[PDB]
Each structure stands twice: as structure tokens, then as C-alpha cells.
Coordinates of C-alpha atoms in Angstrom, one line a residue:
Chain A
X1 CA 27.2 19.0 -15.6
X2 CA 24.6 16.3 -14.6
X3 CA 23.9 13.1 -14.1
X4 CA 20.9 10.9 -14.3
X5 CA 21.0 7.1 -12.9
X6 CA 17.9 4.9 -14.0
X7 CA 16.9 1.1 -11.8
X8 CA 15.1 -0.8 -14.1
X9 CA 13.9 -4.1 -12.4
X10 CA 13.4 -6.7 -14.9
X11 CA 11.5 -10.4 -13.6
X12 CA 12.6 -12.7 -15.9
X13 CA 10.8 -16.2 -16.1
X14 CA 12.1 -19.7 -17.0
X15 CA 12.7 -20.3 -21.0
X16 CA 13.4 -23.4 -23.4
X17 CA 17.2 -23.3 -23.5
X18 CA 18.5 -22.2 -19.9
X19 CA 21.3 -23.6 -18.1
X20 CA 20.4 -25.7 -15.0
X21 CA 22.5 -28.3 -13.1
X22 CA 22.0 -30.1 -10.5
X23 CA 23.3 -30.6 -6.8
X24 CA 26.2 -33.5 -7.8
X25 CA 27.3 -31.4 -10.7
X26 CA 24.5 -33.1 -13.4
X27 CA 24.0 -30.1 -15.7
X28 CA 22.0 -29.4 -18.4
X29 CA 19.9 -26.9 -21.0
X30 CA 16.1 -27.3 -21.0
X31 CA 14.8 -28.3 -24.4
X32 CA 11.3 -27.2 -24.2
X33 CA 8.4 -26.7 -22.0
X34 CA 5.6 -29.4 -21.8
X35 CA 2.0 -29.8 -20.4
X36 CA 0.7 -31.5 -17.4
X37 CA -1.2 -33.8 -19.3
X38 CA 1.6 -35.0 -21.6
X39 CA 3.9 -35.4 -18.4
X40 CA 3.8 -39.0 -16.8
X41 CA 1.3 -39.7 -13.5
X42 CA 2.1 -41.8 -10.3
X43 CA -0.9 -44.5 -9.4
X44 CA -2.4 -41.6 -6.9
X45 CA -2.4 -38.8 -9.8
X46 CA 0.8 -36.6 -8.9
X47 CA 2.5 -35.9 -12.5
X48 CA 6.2 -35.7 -12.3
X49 CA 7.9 -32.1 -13.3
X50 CA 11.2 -33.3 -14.1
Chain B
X1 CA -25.9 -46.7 -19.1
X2 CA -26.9 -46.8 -15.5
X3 CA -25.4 -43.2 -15.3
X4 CA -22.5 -42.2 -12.6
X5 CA -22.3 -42.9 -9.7
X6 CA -21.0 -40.2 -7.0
X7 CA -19.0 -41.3 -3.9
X8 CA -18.2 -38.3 -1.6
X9 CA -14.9 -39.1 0.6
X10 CA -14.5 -35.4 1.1
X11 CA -16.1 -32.2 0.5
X12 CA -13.1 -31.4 -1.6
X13 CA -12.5 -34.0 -3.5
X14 CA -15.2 -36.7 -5.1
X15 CA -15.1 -39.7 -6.9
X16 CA -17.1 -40.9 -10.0
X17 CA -17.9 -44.2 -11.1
X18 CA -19.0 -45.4 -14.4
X19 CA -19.9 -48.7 -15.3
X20 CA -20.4 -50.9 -17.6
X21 CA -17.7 -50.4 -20.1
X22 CA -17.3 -52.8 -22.6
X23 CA -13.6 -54.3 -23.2
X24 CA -11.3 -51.8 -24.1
X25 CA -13.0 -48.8 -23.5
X26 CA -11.8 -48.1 -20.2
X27 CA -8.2 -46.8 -21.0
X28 CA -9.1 -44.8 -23.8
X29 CA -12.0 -42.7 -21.8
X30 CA -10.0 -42.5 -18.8
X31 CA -7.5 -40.8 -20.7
X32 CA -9.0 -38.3 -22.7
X33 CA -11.3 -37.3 -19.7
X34 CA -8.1 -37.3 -17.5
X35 CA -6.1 -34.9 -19.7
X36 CA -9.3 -32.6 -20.7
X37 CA -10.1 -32.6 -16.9
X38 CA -6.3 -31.2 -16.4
X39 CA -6.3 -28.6 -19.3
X40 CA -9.3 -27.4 -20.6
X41 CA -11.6 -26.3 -17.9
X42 CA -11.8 -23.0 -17.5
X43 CA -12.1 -20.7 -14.3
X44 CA -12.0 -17.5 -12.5
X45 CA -9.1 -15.6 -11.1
X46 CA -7.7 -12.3 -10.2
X47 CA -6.0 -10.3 -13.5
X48 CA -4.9 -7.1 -11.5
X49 CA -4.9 -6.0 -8.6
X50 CA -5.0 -1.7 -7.6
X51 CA -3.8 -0.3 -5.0
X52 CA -3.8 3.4 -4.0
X53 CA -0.3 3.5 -1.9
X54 CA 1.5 1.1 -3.8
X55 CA 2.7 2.3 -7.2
X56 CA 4.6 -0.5 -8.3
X57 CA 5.5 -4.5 -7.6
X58 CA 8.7 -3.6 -5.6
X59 CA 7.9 -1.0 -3.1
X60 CA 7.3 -0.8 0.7
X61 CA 3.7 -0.2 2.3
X62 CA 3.9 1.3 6.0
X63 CA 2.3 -0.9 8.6
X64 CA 2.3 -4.3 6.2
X65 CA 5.1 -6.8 7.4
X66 CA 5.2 -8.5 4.2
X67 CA 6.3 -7.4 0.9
X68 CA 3.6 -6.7 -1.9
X69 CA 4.6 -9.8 -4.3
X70 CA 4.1 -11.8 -1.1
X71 CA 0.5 -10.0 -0.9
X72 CA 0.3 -10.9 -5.2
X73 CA 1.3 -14.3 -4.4
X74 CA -1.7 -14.7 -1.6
X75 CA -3.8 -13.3 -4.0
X76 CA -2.9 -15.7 -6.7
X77 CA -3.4 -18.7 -4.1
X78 CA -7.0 -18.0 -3.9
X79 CA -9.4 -19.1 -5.5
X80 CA -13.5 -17.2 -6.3
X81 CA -16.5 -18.8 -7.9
X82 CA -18.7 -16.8 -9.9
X83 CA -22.2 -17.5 -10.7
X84 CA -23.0 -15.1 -13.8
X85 CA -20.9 -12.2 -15.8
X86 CA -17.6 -12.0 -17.3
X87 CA -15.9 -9.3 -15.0
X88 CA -16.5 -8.6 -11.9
X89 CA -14.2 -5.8 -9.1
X90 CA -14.0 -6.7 -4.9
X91 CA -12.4 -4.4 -2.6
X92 CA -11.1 -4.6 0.5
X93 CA -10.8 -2.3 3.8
X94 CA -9.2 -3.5 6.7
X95 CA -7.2 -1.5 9.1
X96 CA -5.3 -1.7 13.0
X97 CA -3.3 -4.8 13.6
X98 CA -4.6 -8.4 13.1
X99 CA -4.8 -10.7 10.2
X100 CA -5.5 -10.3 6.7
X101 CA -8.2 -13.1 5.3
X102 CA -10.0 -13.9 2.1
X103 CA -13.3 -13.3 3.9
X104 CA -12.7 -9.7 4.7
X105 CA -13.3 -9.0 1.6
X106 CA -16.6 -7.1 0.4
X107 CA -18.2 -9.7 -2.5
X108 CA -21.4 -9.5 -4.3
X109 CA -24.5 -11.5 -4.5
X110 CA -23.2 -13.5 -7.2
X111 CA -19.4 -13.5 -6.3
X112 CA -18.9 -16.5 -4.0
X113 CA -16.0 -16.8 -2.1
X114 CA -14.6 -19.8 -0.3
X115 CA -13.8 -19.0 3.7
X116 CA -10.1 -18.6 3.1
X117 CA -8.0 -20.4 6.0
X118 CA -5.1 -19.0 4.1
X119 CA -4.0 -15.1 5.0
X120 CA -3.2 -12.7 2.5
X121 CA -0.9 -10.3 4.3
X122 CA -0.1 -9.5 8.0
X123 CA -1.2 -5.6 9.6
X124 CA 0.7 -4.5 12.7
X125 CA 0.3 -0.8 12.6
X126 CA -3.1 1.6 12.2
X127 CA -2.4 2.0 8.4
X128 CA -5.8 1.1 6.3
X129 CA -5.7 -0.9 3.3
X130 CA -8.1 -0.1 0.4
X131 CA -7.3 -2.5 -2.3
X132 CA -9.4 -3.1 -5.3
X133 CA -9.1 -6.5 -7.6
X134 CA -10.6 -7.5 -10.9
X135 CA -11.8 -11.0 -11.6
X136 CA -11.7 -12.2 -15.5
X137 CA -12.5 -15.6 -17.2
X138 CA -10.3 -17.5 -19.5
X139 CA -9.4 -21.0 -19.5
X140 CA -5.2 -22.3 -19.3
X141 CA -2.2 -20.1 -18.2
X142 CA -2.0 -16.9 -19.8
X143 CA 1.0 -14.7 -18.7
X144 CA 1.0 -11.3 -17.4
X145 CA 3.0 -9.9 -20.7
X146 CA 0.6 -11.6 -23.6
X147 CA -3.2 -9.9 -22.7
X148 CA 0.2 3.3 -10.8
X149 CA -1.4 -0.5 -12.6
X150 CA -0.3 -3.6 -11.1
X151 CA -0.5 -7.2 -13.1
X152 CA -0.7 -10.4 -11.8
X153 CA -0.4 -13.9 -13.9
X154 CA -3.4 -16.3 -13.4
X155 CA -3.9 -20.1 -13.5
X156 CA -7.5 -20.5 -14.9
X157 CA -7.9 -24.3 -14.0
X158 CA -9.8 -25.3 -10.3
X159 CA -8.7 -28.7 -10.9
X160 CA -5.5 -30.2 -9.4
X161 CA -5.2 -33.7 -9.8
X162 CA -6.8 -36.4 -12.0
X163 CA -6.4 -40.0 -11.8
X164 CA -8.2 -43.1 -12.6
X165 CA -7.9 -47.1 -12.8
X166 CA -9.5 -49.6 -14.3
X167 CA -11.3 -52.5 -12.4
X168 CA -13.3 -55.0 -13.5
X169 CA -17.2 -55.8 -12.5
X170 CA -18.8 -59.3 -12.4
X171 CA -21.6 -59.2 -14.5
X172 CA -23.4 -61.6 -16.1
X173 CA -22.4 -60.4 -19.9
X174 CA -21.0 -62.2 -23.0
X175 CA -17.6 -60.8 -21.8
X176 CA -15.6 -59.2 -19.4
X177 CA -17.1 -56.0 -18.7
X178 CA -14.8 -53.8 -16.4
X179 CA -15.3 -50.1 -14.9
X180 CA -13.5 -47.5 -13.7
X181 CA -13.5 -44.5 -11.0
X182 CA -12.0 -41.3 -11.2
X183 CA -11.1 -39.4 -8.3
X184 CA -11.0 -35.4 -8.9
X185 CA -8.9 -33.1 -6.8
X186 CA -10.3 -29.5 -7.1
X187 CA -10.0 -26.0 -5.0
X188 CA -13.4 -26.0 -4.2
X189 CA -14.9 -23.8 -6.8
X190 CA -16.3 -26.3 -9.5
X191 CA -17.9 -29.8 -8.5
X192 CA -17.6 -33.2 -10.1
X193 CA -20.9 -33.3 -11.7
X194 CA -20.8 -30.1 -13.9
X195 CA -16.4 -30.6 -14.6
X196 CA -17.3 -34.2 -16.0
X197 CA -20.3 -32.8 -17.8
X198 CA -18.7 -29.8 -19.8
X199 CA -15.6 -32.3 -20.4
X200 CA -18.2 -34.7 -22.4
X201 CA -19.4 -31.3 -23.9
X202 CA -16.0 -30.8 -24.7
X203 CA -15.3 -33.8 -26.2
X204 CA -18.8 -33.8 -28.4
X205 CA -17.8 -30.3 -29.6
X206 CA -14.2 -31.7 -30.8
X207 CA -15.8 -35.0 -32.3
X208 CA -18.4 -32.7 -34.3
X209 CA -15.6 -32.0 -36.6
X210 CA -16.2 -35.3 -38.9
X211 CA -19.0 -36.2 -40.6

């Protein structure tokens, strides 16, 4: 007799253990999730994210 | 001992210098003031943001040509100093066509706001915006899940980049004294002097621990 159709929008962010590959077919799962200040720095301060 | 010495290449970013170190102190300081520059100082930023015509994060606004995440993320991108308090709420009312800045919005006496080159959303018809935000302080990254209601994450942390190097300074010593300089990259909101000072009160605090 009725009908009742619910949208639910979930955002879901990145977490330690999500698929990701590459452009060249290099996948991989990410282990975990680390700092800035623990990630290694270039001579003019940038820190590399991957 | 002589105290820092403050070079100013830009009104954004300065440059410390401290000298003499004796031999292997350089690294170690350099360091520790490097990482507690990068993730413990804390700042201001906006927690939530409430508007009256938009009811939630995925909706339409007549006479805006963005989206409203695009108006969250321009909101996130800024960046407010506060002199005193703990909370603190700015609205905004702009209406016709034009563009949207971070000055156009009404601050206090004690809310300072930079001049905002960057636009927070686009207006093309006769529609007024009346949006009300909340500023909170914290220190880190806190998400918008561990604290008609919008939420919006925050990065509390006005600097961007640290780095440092090591050089050495002929002196006439008993050794090789060398120094180094530390150029800080921030948003504008805290300066070199008082970032330096509360990361030494930082690191006074955390050494208080033995003994």
C-alpha cells in the first residue's frame, strides 16, 4: 500500500587498510596513518606524504 | 647566550638564528623544535558554521554558483587570530552580485582577521547571505565525528613548514662551535618570536617530569 524510499549520504574518509594502486598497476593496502613530524623532510622543509 | 637573532625575508615567513651551540647540540634542538613547531602549537579555527537557508552539507542555495562544501572548504582555508577568550561567533551579510571575501565579514575588537585575497563563494543573483560561524581553540586535528547544524573539521596548527641546518661559526673557542637557523612558514596568525617561545615552554613543561 505504500512505499517509503530513504537517501542517506554517507562521507567516508581515508582509513589504515584501504586498497589503493597506482597509475602502472603498483597496488597496495595502507598500513597506518603517520604524523608530519615522523615523515621524512626535503633540504627546503616540504615532508613527503607518500 | 647572545639571544636570537630575527631576520625578516618576508612578512610571512621569518627566520631565527641562534648561536653559539656547543658541538652536538645543533641536531638534537633543531629537531625537537622542528617537530614541536609542526605538531603542538595550537590555534584558532572555524568548528561550525549556520546557516539559515541551508539545512544540510548537500543542498542547493539560489543565487550562489558554488556548492556549500565548496563554501565549507573556503571557510576551512582561512585562517583568524584571536587576542583573548575561548569562543567567539562572526556573521556575515552580503547580498547582489560580486565577490564573496574574508573581509566582509563583521569581526570584533579582539577578533583579527587577515585581509583574505582568497574568496569564499561567488553571488550572481539578489539573494542575501546571513551566515553565522563559531571560532573554538584546540591544538592538532580533531575530526568532525569525535567532539538544521552544519560541522566542519579544523586544522588547529598556523604553522606550515619547518626546516633547519646546521652551519658552523668561527669563533675563537676551545672547539668548534656551529649554529643554526630556522626558517618558519606560517599563515600569518602567530609570529616567530611567541611560536619559538611557547615551544621552549613546551619543552620545559615535558622535561619537568624528572627530578
Amino acid at each position: 500500500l505504500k512505499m517509503v524510499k530513504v537517501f542517506l549520504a554517507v562521507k567516508r574518509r581515508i582509513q589504515p587498510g584501504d586498497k589503493m594502486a597506482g597509475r602502472h598497476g603498483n597496488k597496495g593496502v595502507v598500513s597506518n596513518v603517520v604524523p608530519v613530524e615522523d615523515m621524512p623532510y626535503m633540504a627546503t622543509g616540504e615532508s613527503v606524504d607518500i | 647566550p647572545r639571544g636570537p637573532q630575527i631576520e625578516r625575508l618576508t612578512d610571512n615567513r621569518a627566520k631565527v638564528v641562534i648561536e653559539p651551540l656547543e658541538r652536538g647540540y645543533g641536531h638534537t634542538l633543531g629537531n625537537a623544535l622542528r617537530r614541536v613547531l609542526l605538531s603542538s602549537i595550537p590555534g584558532f579555527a572555524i568548528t561550525e558554521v549556520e546557516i539559515d537557508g541551508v539545512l544540510h552539507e548537500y543542498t542547493t542555495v539560489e543565487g550562489l554558483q558554488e556548492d556549500v562544501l565548496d563554501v565549507l572548504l573556503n571557510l576551512k582555508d582561512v585562517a583568524i587570530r584571536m587576542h583573548s577568550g575561548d569562543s567567539a561567533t562572526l556573521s556575515l551579510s552580503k547580498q547582489g552580485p560580486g565577490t564573496v571575501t574574508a573581509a566582509d565579514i563583521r569581526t570584533d575588537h579582539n577578533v583579527e582577521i587577515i585581509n583574505g585575497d582568497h574568496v569564499i563563494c561567488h553571488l550572481t543573483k539578489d539573494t542575501a547571505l546571513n551566515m553565522r560561524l563559531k571560532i573554538e581553540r584546540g591544538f592538532g586535528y580533531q575530526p568532525a565525528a569525535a567532539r538544521g547544524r552544519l560541522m566542519l573539521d579544523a586544522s588547529f596548527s598556523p604553522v606550515r613548514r619547518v626546516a633547519y641546518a646546521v652551519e658552523a661559526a668561527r669563533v675563537e673557542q676551545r672547539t668548534d662551535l656551529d649554529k643554526l637557523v630556522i626558517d618558519i612558514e606560517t599563515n600569518g596568525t602567530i609570529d616567530a618570536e611567541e611560536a619559538v617561545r611557547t615551544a621552549a615552554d613546551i619543552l620545559s613543561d615535558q622535561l619537568s617530569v624528572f627530578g
